[PDB]
Amino acid sequence: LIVTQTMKGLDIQKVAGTWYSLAMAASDISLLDAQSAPLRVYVEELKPTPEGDLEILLQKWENGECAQKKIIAEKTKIPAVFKIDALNENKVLVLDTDYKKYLLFCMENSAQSLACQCLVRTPEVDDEALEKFDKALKALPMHIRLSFNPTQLEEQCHI
Amino acid sequence: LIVTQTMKGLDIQKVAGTWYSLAMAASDISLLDAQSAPLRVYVEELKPTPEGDLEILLQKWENGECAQKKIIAEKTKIPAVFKIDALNENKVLVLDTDYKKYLLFCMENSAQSLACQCLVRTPEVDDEALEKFDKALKALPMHIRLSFNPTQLEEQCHI
Numbered sequence: 001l002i003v004t005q006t007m008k009g010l011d012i013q014k015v016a017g018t019w020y021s022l023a024m025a026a027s028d029i030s031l032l033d034a035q036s037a038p039l040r041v042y043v044e045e046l047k048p049t050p051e052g053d054l055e056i057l058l059q060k061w062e063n064g065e066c067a068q069k070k071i072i073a074e075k076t077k078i079p080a081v082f083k084i085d086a087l088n089e090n091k092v093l094v095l096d097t098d099y100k101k102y103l104l105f106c107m108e109n110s111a112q113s114l115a116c117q118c119l120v121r122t123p124e125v126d127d128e129a130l131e132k133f134d135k136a137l138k139a140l141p142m143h144i145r146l147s148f149n150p151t152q153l154e155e156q157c158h159i
Numbered sequence: 160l161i162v163t164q165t166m167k168g169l170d171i172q173k174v175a176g177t178w179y180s181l182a183m184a185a186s187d188i189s190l191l192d193a194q195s196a197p198l199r200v201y202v203e204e205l206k207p208t209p210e211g212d213l214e215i216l217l218q219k220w221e222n223g224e225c226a227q228k229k230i231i232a233e234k235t236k237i238p239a240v241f242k243i244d245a246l247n248e249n250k251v252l253v254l255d256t257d258y259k260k261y262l263l264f265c266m267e268n269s270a271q272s273l274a275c276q277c278l279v280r281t282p283e284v285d286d287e288a289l290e291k292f293d294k295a296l297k298a299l300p301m302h303i304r305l306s307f308n309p310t311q312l313e314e315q316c317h318i
């Protein structure tokens with residue numbers, strides 16, 4: 001209920017597969033500043049379950065190393081909106097996707113912390129996907145933005 | 160010779176005084192990511208010498224603490240262009256300023272490392288100064304952008 005762009009007509013099954021975290025942004029610098037910042041997460045693959053939950057594979061820098069992680073985001077009554085079981089509840093929103101090239105999502109908590117990423121299908125700089133991302137962000141109050149080049153995208157934890 | 164926007168008609172004497180580093184961007188993430196990143200520098204005051212050199216007072220996080228620093232940027236034959244005596248030579252460029260509200264500058268080295276800041280006169284979020292900054296940046300290949308809120312701007316090293 002900060003983010004108010006969601007994608008109409010979302011077919012979750014078609015976001016399945018390989019993704020690249022091409023750009024990220026967050027509402028506070030410390031959500032992304034360091035390599036082990038809480039929301040510095042690199043997406044690897046999306047696996048929707050037949051029941052419509054979303055399994056997420058990614059990487060994080062945690063213990064001085066690049067570690068694998070698996071998250072499950074459970075479906076809500078809103079197709080573009082999912083829920084992650086954390087200590088405090090955390091909504092995931094799909095803002096926009098064309099399935100075959102890019103996907104924009106944000107994660108936020110119910111009571112002013114927010115992070116969004118531009119996911120792309122391949123290790124290339126997609127200018128217009130980043131345009132769509134920047135348009136979606138201009139509303140939101142972001143204070144850090146990160147972008148990765150094709151070299152880093154082919155590296156674990158984008159080193 | 161990456162940055163090709165400079166300000167025509169620059170009167171260096173009139174940038175004198177109090178500035179706030181409202182936003183920064185850099186060509187590589189590690190130039191700004193951590194609190195002690197090499198180019199995470201917060202500008203405090205500009206002091207042009209009568210001879211047209213530029214003294215710069217600022218703060219940096221260095222030794223686990225917010226430390227004062229003084230730099231002098233020496234004039235060149237180009238009024239919007241200055242030079243800092245480092246190990247390797249480092250050009251400072253004034254892209255644009257209206258003297259009384261904002262100033263945009265970049266620093267770069269002669270052989271693909273680059274950082275730019277939006278300096279403002281007061282601890283307020285100046286939307287159009289940030290617009291001008293974002294327009295100036297769209298050309299350049301930046302990969303990290305940081306923005307500070309009025310609270311942090313009134314704090315040493317923007318904590």
Ligand SMILES: CCCCNc1ccc(C(=O)OCCN(C)C)cc1
Pocket residue numbers: 015038039041043054056058060069071073084092093094103105107
């Ligand atoms: C279309 C859905 C893409 C969403 N991908 C996501 C990626 C990461 C997260 C997420 O919550 O990661 C941060 C928590 N880590 C540190 C345990 C949540 C969703």
Ligand SMILES: CCCCNc1ccc(C(=O)OCCN(C)C)cc1
Pocket residue numbers: 174197198200202213215217219228230232243251252253262264266
């Ligand atoms: C209009 C001129 C404003 C320029 N202000 C500047 C601020 C900082 C620097 C600069 O070089 O700072 C980084 C080097 N530190 C870590 C020793 C260079 C110029």
